[PDB]
């Protein structure tokens, strides 16, 4: 397991975020003030469209950011 802490990875058109333990984060995350949802299987950010999460529809920008909240 490679050290890779408290940062994003942009890989093959997908977006991942790594916590302090060098693992890809899943589910809802606030990163630098912005909201993201990382899919529980792939760890990829919900991005570039509308997604239903727990019965609520949200929009995520291409950068993965949830439109307001």
């Amino acid at each position, epitope marked *: 397991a490679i050290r890779y802490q*408290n*940062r*994003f990875l942009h890989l093959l058109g997908k977006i991942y*975020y790594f*916590g*302090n*333990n060098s693992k890809a*984060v899943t*589910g*809802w*995350q*606030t*990163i*630098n*003030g912005k909201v993201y949802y990382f899919m529980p299987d792939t760890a990829m950010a919900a991005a570039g469209g509308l997604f239903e999460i727990d019965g609520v529809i949200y929009f995520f920008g291409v950068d993965g950011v949830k439109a307001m909240g």
Partner: nanobody
Amino acid sequence: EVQLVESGGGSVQAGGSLRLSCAASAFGNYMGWFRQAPGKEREGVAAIRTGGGSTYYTDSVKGRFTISQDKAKNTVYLQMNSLKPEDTAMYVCATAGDRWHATDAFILRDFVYEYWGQGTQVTVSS
């Protein structure tokens, strides 16, 4: 909603020192010290990541201020040496919940913090 309480503020002469304490009901991923002078915005001063203890500082306090944690006592500390008039401010500590993260370049920006304490006053006289 994490509770934070600061202490150790005071009046001191320029060149002197203070040590602030921040008691927290829990630590997030990071603990920060901010300060706010009259009429200015809050500015982040120092931050520590609670896993491993990496420390970050704003350029104006490097070599003067030191941030540290005691996880046993759920307390974070700011040792403030070689104080100057421009260090006068209300000092407040902050943290965030479990799914809150900051990258190195943002760990001293106020918008990566969710929970704030009350403030302890620091006044540096000439």
